[PDB]
Amino acid sequence: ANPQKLVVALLPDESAATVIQNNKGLEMYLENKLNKDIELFVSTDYSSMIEVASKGRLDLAYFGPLSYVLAKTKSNIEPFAALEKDGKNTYQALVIGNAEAGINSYEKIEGKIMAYGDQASTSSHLIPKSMLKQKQLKAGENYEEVFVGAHDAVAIAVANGKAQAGGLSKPIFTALIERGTIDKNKVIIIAESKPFPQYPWTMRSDLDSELKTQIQQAFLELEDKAILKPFKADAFTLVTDQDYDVVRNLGEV
């Protein structure tokens, strides 16, 4: 209940060095506020994060929405905060196409290779897959799916031409363009999803009351631009479990 050190896991939605480096600023702030030491953990894939969480081995975990839903079925954890941008607490998936191949509509996806990220990804699997299904594209019926493991790997493949289309997170696509990792004109945005709730920061439920409240507070109070720059976020807001029922519903269907 009162750990001297805090194990903090971060979703491997991109390469580990990108993820680690994005949260370094936030790690330092949380050391100063909680007066505790933090070791970051970035798993090899989303499923191994979910496993590590299900051992009671993590103190905090920054999960994606679907991965949170899956981890919560077998882990004693509690969502408490999520990024806010422009007083909004949500985010979008994109469907993108390879521009050389002229992949600029849903109809051009038919009979081609569609890149997804991790199988437990919300915005690089579940969401883009539902968007494709609403448009009568079904995996292994009228197109071929490949799982390339991460959002940055999706962007890379689609821009390369190894895949003709892909599904990934709109903020990650945006960061990738701004950092120069991907050339913008090699990819065409086909569609954007509806709003889904942002990734939940979660904590272990059997943590001490006063520590749980201190952690939540630390997030809610954070205001400086430099620390949130790698997420293009103005703040954190609070979230609860029920906010993820929209994701469960889509996961059910």
Residue numbers in the entry: 10 to 262
Show passages lifted from the paper:
To determine the structural mechanism of phosphite selectivity we co-crystallised Te_PtxB and Pm_PhnD with phosphite resulting in high-resolution structures (1.95 and 1.46 Å respectively) of the closed, ligand-bound complexes. In the closed form, the amino acids that form the walls of the binding pocket pack tightly against the phosphite moiety and a single water molecule that is also buried in the binding pocket. Each oxygen atom of the phosphite contributes to an extensive hydrogen bonding network to the main chain and side chains of a cluster of conserved residues from lobe 2 (Te_PtxB; Y55, Y100, S130, T131, S132 and H160; Pm_PhnD; Y46, S126, T127, S128, H158 and D205, Figs. 1d, e and 2e, f). In Te_PtxB, it is not possible to determine the protonation state of the phosphite from the pattern of hydrogen bonding, but given the pH of the crystallisation experiment (pH 4.2), it is also likely that the mono-anionic form of phosphite is bound (phosphite pKa 1.5, 6.739). Both proteins contain a conserved histidine as one of the phosphite ligands (Te_PtxB; H160 and Pm_PhnD; H158), which could help stabilise the negative charge on the phosphite. However, in Te_PtxB, one imidazole nitrogen atom acts as a hydrogen bond acceptor to a mainchain N-H (S178), suggesting that the histidine is neutral. In both structures, the hydrogen atom at the R1 position of the phosphite points towards lobe 1, packing against the face of the aromatic ring of a tyrosine residue (Te_PtxB; Y208, Pm_PhnD; Y206). This tyrosine sidechain forms a cap that is stabilised by intramolecular hydrogen bonds to residues on lobe 1 (Te_PtxB; D22, Pm_PhnD; D13 and N176), which in the closed conformation, contributes to the network of interactions that connect both lobes of the protein and bury the binding pocket from solvent.
